[PDB]
């Protein structure tokens, strides 16, 4: 996982920016619009690489308003989870319904029903935890999860995970 | 509409039709730019085009007060037409045809006004008086040929068309005291 992807964005510049700090404004407008966004298609666009060699290309000037539209080609590190992927992460929240595991930029929810048999939610614990005989899972512990499926909400990707099978769980 | 910048309770606004704008008379802010000619737009529904050459003429006016909303064209002869298909498609409209039939009591009012030499504004009041009182429990079981004979004097008494009750006794029919009580239970409604 954690890919590097070759992407291209279309930015449009209003003529008043047709000055010497043009390429700079463009690369900036790229980092504003793309970096830290999130799409179902590519995942989380986390960071744009090689700031110096971002290719601005030539800008086609639209024929109505004087503005000019560029196709900025850039390289980025992205994050896209897949069903079946196994990931380590940290517990960030933990309720009577399961717990969330923050993995990279995205959280994964482990429903109380994809959990080992005797590992059950005890609310008298401080904080509320999952309290097996040889396991205690709470709000700060490290977990290894298997992603049972992803949900795409074009702004973020959320997913649901299992710790039931062999080799999973706490670490 | 009310100007977003000013907001005074009596919202003084003008319709500068000639520039096709709706302006706030105080600050001068234009509140709308798309503006349509209602006269010429109404010309597309009620025109003088009976031939069928006008490309502007594209709709028809109806009367939602009298016949409700019954949109329905009629199969008829055109330029290139066989007299066979007209008959079949009309004989087919016969199988598709109670209160949706009591609208033929408008044909009783129309044929009574034209027999009484009455204007087009009187019929449409007699048809609206009859539609709003023929299914009343306040009229219940009055002589059904004397409640439409009473709604014609109700339509004449608003359109300023002088017609005595004895003038409508000559038309149909009228039983005097029978269409005189009916001319009062409706008058209350």
């Amino acid at each position: 996982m954690f890919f590097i992807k070759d992407l291209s964005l279309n930015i449009t510049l209003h003529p008043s920016f047709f000055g010497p700090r043009m390429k700079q404004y463009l690369k900036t407008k790229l980092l504003e619009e793309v970096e830290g966004s999130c799409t179902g298609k590519f995942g989380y666009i986390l960071c744009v690489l090689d700031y110096d060699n971002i290719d601005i290309q030539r800008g086609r000037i639209l024929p109505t308003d004087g503005s000019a539209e560029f196709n900025v080609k850039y390289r980025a590190v992205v994050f896209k989870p897949f069903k079946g992927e196994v990931v380590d992460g940290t517990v960030v929240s933990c309720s009577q319904h399961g717990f969330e595991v923050q993995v990279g930029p995205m959280k994964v929810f482990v429903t109380k029903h994809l959990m080992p048999q005797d590992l059950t939610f005890n609310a008298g614990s401080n904080p509320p935890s999952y309290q097996s005989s040889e396991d205690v899972i709470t709000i700060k512990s490290r977990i290894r999860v298997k992603i049972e499926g992803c949900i795409s909400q074009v702004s973020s990707i959320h997913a649901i995970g299992s710790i039931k099978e062999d080799y999973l769980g706490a670490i | 509409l009310t100007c977003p910048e000013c907001k005074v309770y009596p919202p003084k606004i003008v319709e500068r039709f000639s520039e096709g704008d709706v302006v706030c008379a105080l600050c001068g802010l234009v509140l709308s730019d798309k503006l349509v000619d209602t006269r010429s737009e109404w010309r597309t529904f009620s025109n003088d085009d009976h031939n069928g050459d006008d490309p502007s003429r594209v709709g028809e006016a109806s009367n939602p007060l009298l016949d409700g909303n019954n949109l329905s064209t009629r199969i008829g002869k055109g330029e290139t037409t066989d007299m066979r298909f007209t008959k079949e498609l009309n004989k087919a409209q016969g199988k598709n045809v109670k209160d949706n039939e009591v609208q033929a009591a408008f044909a009783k009012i129309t044929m009574l006004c034209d027999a009484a030499e009455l204007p087009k504004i009187v019929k449409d009041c007699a048809k609206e008086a009859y539609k709003l009182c023929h299914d009343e429990k306040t009229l219940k079981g009055k002589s059904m040929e004397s409640i439409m004979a009473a709604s014609i004097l109700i339509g004449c008494r608003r359109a300023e068309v002088a017609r005595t009750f004895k003038e409508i006794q000559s038309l149909i029919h009228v039983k005097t005291k029978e269409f005189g009580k009916t001319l009062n239970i409706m008058k209350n409604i």
Binding site: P20, M22, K23, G59, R60, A68 | -
Partner: protein, 112 residues
């Protein structure tokens, strides 16, 4: 040889009026009527029956009967005709529209 006689016959109609049109204009018309392989009439069942864009053909004479056929034949209009871009309200690919203009950052930094 037909192309020639066709120019010749058109030329005669113009020169009979004592008028004069530059050869190219008449040659262009004639050349168009004949590049199909034979005499293509300048009529609804001639030039407008070629395999051009569907909206283009529809703007002259057969309109709806052209758009139904356009539908059932699943035509694809590549929008190179002037007619198409006019219907679409876009800058036509003619004259001032036959190229494209782009800014170059390299030389913009040069000049200033």
């Amino acid at each position: 040889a037909g192309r020639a006689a066709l120019y010749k016959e058109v030329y005669n109609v113009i020169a009979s009026d004592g008028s004069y049109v530059n050869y190219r204009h008449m040659a262009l018309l004639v050349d168009v009527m004949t590049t199909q392989g034979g005499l293509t009439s300048v009529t609804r069942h001639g030039f407008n029956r070629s395999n051009t864009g569907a909206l283009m053909r529809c703007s002259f004479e057969e309109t709806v009967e052209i758009l139904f056929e356009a539908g059932a034949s699943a035509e694809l209009d590549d929008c190179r005709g002037v007619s198409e871009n006019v219907i679409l309200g876009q800058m036509a690919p003619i004259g001032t529209g036959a190229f494209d203009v782009m800014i170059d950052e390299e030389s913009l930094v040069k000049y200033m």
